[PDB]
Coordinates of C-alpha atoms and ligand atoms in Angstrom, one line a residue:
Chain A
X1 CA 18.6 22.6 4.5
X2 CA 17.6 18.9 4.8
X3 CA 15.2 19.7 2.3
X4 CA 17.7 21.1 -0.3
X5 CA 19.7 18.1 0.6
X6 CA 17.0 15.5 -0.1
X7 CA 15.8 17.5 -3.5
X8 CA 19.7 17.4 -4.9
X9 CA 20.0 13.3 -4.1
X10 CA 19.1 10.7 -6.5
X11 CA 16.0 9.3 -4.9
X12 CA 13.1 11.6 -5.3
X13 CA 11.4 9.8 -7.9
X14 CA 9.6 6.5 -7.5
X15 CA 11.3 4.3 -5.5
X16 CA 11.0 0.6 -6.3
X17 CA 10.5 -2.3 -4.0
X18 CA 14.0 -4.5 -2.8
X19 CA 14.0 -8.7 -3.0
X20 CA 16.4 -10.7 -1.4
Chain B
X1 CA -5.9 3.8 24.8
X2 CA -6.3 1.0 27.4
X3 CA -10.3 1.9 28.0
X4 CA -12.2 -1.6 26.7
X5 CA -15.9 -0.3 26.6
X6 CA -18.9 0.1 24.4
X7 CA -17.0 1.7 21.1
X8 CA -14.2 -1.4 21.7
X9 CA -17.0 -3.6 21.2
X10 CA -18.7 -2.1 18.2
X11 CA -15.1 -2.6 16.4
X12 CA -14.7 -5.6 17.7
X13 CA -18.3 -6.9 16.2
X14 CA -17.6 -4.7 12.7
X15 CA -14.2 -7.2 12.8
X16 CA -16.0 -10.3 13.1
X17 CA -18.2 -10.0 10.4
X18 CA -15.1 -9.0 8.2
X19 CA -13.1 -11.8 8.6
X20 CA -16.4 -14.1 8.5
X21 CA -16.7 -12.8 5.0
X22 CA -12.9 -12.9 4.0
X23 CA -12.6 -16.2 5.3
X24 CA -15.2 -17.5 2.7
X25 CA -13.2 -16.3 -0.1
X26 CA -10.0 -17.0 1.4
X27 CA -10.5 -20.4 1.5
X28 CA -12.5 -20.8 -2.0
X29 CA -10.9 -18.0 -4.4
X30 CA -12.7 -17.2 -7.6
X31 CA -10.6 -17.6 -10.3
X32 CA -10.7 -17.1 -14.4
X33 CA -13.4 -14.6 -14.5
X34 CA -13.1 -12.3 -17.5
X35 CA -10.8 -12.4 -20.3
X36 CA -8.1 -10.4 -22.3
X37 CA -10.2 -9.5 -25.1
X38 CA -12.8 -8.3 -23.1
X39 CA -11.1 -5.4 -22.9
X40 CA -10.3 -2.3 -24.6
X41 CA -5.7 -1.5 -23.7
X42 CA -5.7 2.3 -23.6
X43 CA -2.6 4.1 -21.5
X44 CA 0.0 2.4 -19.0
X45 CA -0.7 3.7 -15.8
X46 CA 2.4 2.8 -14.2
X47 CA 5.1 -0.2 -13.7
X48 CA 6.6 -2.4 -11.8
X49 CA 9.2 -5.6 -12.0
X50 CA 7.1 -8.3 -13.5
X51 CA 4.8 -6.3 -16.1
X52 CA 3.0 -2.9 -16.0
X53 CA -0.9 -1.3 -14.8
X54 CA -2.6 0.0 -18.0
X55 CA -6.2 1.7 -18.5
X56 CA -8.7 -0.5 -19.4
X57 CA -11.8 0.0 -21.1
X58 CA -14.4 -3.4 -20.5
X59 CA -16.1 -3.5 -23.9
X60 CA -19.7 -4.9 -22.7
X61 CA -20.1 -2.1 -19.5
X62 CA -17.9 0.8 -20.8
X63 CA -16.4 1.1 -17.3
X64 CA -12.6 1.7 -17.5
X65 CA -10.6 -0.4 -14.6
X66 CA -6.9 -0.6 -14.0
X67 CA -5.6 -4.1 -15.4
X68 CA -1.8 -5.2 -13.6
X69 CA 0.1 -7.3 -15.8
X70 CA 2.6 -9.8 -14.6
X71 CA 4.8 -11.5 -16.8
X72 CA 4.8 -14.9 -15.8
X73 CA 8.3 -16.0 -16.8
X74 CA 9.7 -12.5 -15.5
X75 CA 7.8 -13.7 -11.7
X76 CA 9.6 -16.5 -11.7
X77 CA 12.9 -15.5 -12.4
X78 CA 12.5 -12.9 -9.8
X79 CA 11.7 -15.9 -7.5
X80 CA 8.2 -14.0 -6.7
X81 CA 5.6 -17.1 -7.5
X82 CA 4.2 -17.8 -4.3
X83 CA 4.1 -13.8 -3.4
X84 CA 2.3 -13.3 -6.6
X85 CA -0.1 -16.5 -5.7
X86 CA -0.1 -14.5 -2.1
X87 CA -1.4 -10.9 -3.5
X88 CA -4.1 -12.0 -5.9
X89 CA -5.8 -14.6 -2.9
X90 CA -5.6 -11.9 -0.7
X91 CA -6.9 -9.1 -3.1
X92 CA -9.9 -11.0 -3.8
X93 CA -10.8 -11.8 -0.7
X94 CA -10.7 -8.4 1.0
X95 CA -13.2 -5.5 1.1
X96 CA -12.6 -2.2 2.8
X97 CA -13.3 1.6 1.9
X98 CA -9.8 2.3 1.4
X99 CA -8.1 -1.0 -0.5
X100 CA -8.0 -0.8 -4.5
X101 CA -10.8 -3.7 -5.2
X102 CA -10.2 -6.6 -7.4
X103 CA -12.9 -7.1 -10.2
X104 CA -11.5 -9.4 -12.5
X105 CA -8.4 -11.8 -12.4
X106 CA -7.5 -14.5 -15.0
X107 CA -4.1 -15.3 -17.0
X108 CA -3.5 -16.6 -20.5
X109 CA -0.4 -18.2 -22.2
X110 CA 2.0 -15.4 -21.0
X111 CA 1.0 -13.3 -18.4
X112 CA -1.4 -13.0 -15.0
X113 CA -4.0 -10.4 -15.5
X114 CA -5.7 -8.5 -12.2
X115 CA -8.4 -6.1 -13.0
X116 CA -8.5 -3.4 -10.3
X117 CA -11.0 -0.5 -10.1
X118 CA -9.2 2.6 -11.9
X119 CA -8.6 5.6 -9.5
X120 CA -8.2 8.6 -11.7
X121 CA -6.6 11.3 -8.8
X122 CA -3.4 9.8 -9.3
X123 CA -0.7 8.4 -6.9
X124 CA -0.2 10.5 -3.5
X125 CA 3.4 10.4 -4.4
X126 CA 2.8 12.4 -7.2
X127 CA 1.0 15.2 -5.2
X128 CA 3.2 15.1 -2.3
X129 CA 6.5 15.5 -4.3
X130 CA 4.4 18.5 -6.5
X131 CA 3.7 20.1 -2.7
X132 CA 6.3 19.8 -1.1
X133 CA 4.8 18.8 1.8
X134 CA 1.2 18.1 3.1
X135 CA 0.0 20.1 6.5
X136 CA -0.4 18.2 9.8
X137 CA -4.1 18.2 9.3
X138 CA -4.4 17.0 6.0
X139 CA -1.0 13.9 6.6
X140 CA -3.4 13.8 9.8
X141 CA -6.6 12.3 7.3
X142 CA -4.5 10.6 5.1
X143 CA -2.3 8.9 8.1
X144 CA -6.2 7.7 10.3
X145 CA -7.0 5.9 7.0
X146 CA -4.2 4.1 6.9
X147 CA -4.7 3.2 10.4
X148 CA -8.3 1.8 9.7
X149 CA -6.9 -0.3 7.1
X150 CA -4.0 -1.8 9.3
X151 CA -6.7 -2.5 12.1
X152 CA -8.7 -4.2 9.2
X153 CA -5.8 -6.0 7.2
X154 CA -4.0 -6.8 10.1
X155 CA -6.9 -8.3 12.3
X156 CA -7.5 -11.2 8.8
X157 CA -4.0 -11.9 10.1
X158 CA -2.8 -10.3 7.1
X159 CA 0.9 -8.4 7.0
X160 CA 1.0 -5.2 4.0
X161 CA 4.7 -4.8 3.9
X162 CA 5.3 -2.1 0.8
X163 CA 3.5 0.9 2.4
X164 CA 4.9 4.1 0.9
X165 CA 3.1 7.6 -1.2
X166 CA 3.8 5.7 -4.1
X167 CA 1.4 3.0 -3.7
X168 CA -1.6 4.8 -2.4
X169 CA -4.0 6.3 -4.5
X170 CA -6.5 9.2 -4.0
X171 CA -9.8 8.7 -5.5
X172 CA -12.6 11.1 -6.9
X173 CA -13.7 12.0 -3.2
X174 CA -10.0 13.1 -1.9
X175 CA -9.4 9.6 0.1
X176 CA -7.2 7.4 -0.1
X177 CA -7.1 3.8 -1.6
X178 CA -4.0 1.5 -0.8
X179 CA -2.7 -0.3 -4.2
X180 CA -0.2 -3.3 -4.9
X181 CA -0.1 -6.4 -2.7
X182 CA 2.5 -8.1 -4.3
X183 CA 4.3 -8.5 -0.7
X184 CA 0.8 -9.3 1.2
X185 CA 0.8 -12.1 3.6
X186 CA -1.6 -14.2 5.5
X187 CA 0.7 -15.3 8.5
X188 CA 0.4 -16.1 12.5
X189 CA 3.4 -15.6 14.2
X190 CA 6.9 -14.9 12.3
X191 CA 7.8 -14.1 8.8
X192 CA 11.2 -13.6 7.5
X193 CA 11.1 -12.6 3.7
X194 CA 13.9 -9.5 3.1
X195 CA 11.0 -7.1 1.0
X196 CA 9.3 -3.8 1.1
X197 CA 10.9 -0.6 0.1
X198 CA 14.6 0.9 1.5
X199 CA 13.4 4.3 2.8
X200 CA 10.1 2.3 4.3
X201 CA 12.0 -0.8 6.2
X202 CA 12.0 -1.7 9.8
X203 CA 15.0 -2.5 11.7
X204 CA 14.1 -5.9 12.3
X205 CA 13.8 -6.4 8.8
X206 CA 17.3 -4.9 7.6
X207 CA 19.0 -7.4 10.2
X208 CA 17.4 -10.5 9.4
X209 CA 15.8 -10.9 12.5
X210 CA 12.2 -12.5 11.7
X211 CA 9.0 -10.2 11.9
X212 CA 5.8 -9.7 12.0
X213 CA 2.7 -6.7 11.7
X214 CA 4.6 -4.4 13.4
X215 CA 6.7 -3.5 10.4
X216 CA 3.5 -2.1 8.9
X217 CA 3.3 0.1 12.0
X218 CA 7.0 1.4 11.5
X219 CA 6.3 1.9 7.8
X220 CA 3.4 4.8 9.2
X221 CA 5.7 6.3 11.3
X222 CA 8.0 7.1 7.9
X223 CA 4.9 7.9 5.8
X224 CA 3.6 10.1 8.6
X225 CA 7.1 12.0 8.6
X226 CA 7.5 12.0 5.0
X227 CA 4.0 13.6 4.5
X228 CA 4.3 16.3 6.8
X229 CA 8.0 17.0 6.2
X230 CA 8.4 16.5 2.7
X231 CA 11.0 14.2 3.0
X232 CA 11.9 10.5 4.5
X233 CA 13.5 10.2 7.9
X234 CA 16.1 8.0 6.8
X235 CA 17.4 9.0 3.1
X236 CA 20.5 8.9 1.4
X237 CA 21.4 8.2 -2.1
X238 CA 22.4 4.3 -2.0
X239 CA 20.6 1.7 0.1
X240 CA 23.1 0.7 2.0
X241 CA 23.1 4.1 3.7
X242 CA 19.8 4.5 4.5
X243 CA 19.6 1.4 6.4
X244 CA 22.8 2.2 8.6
X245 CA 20.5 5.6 8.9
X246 CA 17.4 3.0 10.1
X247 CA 19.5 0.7 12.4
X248 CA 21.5 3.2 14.3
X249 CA 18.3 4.6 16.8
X250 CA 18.3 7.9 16.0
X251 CA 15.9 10.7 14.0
X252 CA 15.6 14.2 13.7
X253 CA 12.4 16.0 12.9
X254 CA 11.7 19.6 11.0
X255 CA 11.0 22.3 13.5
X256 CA 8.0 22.6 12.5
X257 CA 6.8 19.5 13.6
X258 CA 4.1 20.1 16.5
X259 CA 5.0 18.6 19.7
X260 CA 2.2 15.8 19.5
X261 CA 3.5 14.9 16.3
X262 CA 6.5 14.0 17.3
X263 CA 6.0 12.3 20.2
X264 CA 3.7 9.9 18.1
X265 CA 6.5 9.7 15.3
X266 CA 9.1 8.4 18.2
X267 CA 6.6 5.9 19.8
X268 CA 6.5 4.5 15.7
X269 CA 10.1 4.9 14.5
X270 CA 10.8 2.5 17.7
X271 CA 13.2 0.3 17.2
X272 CA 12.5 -1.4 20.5
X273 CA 9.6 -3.4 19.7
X274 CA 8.5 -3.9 22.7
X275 CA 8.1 0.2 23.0
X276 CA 6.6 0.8 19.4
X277 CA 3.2 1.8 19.6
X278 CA 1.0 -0.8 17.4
X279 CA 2.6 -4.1 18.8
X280 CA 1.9 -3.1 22.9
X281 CA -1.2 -4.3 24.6
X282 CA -3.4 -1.6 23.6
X283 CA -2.9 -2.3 20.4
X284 CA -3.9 0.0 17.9
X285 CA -5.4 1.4 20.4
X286 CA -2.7 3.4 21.3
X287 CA -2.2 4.9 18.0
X288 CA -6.2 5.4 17.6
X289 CA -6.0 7.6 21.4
X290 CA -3.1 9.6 20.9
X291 CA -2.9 13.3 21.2
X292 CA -2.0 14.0 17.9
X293 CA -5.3 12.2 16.6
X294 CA -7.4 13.8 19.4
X295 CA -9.6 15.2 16.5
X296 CA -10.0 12.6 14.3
X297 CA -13.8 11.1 14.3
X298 CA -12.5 7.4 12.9
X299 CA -16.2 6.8 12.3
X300 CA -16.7 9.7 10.1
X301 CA -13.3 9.0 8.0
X302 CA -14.2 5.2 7.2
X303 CA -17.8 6.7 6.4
X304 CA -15.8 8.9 4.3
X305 CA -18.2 11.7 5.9
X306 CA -14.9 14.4 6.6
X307 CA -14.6 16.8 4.3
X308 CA -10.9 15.9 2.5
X309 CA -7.9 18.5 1.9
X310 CA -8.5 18.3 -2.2
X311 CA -10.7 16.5 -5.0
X312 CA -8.2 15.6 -7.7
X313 CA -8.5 17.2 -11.1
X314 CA -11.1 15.3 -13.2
X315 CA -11.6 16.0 -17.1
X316 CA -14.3 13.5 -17.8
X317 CA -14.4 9.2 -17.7
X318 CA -11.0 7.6 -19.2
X319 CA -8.4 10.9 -18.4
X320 CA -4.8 10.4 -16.8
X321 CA -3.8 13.5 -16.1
X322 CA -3.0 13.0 -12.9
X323 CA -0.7 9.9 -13.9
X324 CA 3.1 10.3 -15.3
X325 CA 3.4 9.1 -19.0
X326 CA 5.2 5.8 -19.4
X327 CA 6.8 4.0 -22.3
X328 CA 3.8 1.9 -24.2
X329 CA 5.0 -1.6 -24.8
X330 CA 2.5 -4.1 -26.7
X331 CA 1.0 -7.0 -24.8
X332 CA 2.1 -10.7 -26.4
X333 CA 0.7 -13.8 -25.5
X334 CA 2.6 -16.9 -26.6
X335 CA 1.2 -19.7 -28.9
X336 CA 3.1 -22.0 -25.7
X337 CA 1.2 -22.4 -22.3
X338 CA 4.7 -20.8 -19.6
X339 CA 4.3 -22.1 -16.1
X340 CA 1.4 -23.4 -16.1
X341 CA 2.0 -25.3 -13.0
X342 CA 3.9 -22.8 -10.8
X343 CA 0.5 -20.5 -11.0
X344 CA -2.1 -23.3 -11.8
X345 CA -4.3 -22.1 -8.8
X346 CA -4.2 -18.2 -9.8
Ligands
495_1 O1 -5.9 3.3 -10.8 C1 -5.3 2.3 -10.4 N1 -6.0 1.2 -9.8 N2 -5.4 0.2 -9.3 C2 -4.1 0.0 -9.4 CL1 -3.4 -1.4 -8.8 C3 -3.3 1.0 -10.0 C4 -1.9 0.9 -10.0 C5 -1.1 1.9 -10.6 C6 -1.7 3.0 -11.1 C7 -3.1 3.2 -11.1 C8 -3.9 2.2 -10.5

C-alpha cells in the first residue's frame, strides 16, 4: 500500500527546510 | 467564485484596515524590547538550522512564551542574513487569528532572540503522523484557516514559502497557528530564492524559473493531500526524487478521496500556472467557492466560533507534553559583539 510504502522510507519525521 | 458583491466588499474593507496597520510597523519596526535575563530558559521546544525554540518563563508577568534563537554567526554562514532580517520585520508587523505573534525581539553578543506566544497543543505534524490521517472534515477546518491567512499574508504583498504540518501549531481552542517565517517575504512581482521544503515545493520553484504567491497556493494543495491521506503526494526517500515526482505532471490520490476533494487538489497541484486555482482572476475566490468548501462559514472559522475536531491535552501552565524532547544545549553569549553590522537593524 502507498501507505506501507511511505511509513518504511526515511522521511517520516520532521523534514527540514532546503537553501540553495 | 467570480460573484463581486456585498460579502467581497466587507473583505475587501477588513483588508484595508490590515495593511493600514501593517504598513505602520512595516515601515518603523520596534526593535530591542526585552532582554535575555528577563527570562526564566526552561525546555527546548524544537530546532532548526541557526539555533533552537525553548520555553520561556518572563520573570516579572509569569507568562511562559516560546523564545527562537538564532545563532548569529551560524545565519551567516548559512547565507540567511537578509531572510532572518525578512522574518522578524515581518513577524512584528503582522496580526492575524491564526499567525504565532511576536512579543519580544532583541539580540545580544551572540545570538537574535524572538519571543513568540507559546502554543502548548503541539505541532500538527505531530498529531497527524500519531493519526494517521485526519478526516475530510477536520483537514477541511484546518485547510479554510490556512486559506484566511494566505488571503491575509498574501494581500500585505507578503509570500510564506515553508508551509508544511510541521510548522503549524494547534493552540488551546483546537485551531491552528502558523509558526516560523524565516523564508517570509515582502515582494511585488518576481522572487527567485531556491527555499521551502522538498515534499512542499512548486514546480516553478525546482526549475529555477522565478515565482511568486502562487507557490503558497501549491504548498495547500500538498498539505490538503497530506492531511487527509496521511501521506505527501510526491515522496520518496532522497530529494532529488521527489522533485522528478513534482515536475513530471502527474498525481494519484487514495480512493477514498471524495470526488470534490480531488477535483480541488488537481486545480492546486497545477503545474500550469495559468490553471492553478489561487493565481486566476477570481483569486482566492476560487478556492473560498469551491464544492469541497461549500460548508465552511469563513466568518465563523476566523471568529474561531466552529466547534474544532480536538482540544489538545493540557496538564496545567508551563507543560510540553505535546512536544518531542530535544537535546538541551546551554545558551552562550560572547564577551565579543559578532556581526553587529550584518543585523544592526534587527
Ligand atoms: O509554541 C511555540 N510558539 N512559537 C513558536 Cl515559533 C514555536 C516554535 C516551535 C515550537 C513551539 C513554538
Amino acid at each position: 500500500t502507498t501507505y506501507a510504502d511511505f511509513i518504511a522510507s526515511g522521511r517520516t519525521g520532521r523534514r527540514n527546510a532546503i537553501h540553495d | 467564485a467570480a460573484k463581486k458583491g456585498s460579502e467581497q466588499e466587507s473583505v475587501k474593507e477588513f483588508l484595508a484596515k490590515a495593511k493600514e496597520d501593517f504598513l505602520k510597523k512595516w515601515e518603523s519596526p520596534a526593535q530591542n524590547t526585552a532582554h535575555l535575563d528577563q527570562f526564566e530558559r526552561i525546555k527546548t521546544l524544537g530546532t532548526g538550522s541557526f539555533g533552537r525554540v525553548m520555553l520561556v518563563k518572563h520573570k516579572e508577568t509569569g507568562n511562559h512564551y516560546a523564545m527562537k534563537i538564532l545563532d548569529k554567526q551560524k545565519v551567516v554562514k548559512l547565507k540567511q542574513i537578509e531572510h532572518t532580517l525578512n522574518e522578524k520585520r515581518i513577524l512584528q508587523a503582522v496580526n492575524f487569528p491564526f499567525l504565532v505573534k511576536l512579543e519580544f525581539s532583541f539580540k545580544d553578543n551572540s545570538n537574535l532572540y524572538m519571543v513568540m506566544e507559546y502554543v502548548p497543543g503541539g505541532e500538527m505534524f505531530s498529531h497527524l503522523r500519531r493519526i494517521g490521517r485526519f478526516s475530510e472534515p477536520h483537514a477541511r477546518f484546518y485547510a479554510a484557516q490556512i486559506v484566511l491567512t494566505f488571503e491575509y499574508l498574501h494581500s500585505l504583498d507578503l509570500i510564506y514559502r515553508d508551509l508544511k504540518p510541521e510548522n503549524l501549531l494547534i493552540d488551546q481552542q483546537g485551531y491552528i497557528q502558523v509558526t516560523d517565517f524565516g523564508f517570509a517575504k515582502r515582494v511585488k512581482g518576481r522572487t527567485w530564492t531556491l527555499c521551502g521544503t522538498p515534499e512542499y515545493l512548486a514546480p516553478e520553484i525546482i526549475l529555477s524559473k522565478g515565482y511568486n504567491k502562487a507557490v503558497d497556493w501549491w504548498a495547500l494543495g500538498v498539505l490538503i493531500y497530506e492531511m487527509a491521506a496521511g501521506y505527501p503526494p510526491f515522496f520518496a526517500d532522497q530529494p532529488i526524487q521527489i522533485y522528478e515526482k513534482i515536475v513530471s505532471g502527474k498525481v494519484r490520490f487514495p480512493s477514498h478521496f471524495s470526488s470534490d476533494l480531488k477535483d480541488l487538489l488537481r486545480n492546486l497541484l497545477q503545474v500550469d500556472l495559468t490553471k492553478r486555482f489561487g493565481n486566476l482572476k477570481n483569486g482566492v475566490n476560487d478556492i473560498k467557492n469551491h464544492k469541497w468548501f461549500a460548508t465552511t462559514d469563513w466568518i465563523a472559522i476566523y471568529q474561531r466560533k466552529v466547534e474544532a475536531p480536538f482540544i489538545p491535552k493540557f496538564k496545567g501552565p508551563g507543560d510540553t507534553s505535546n512536544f518531542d524532547d530535544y537535546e538541551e544545549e546551554e545558551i552562550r553569549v560572547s564577551i565579543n559583539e559578532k556581526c553587529g553590522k550584518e543585523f544592526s537593524e534587527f
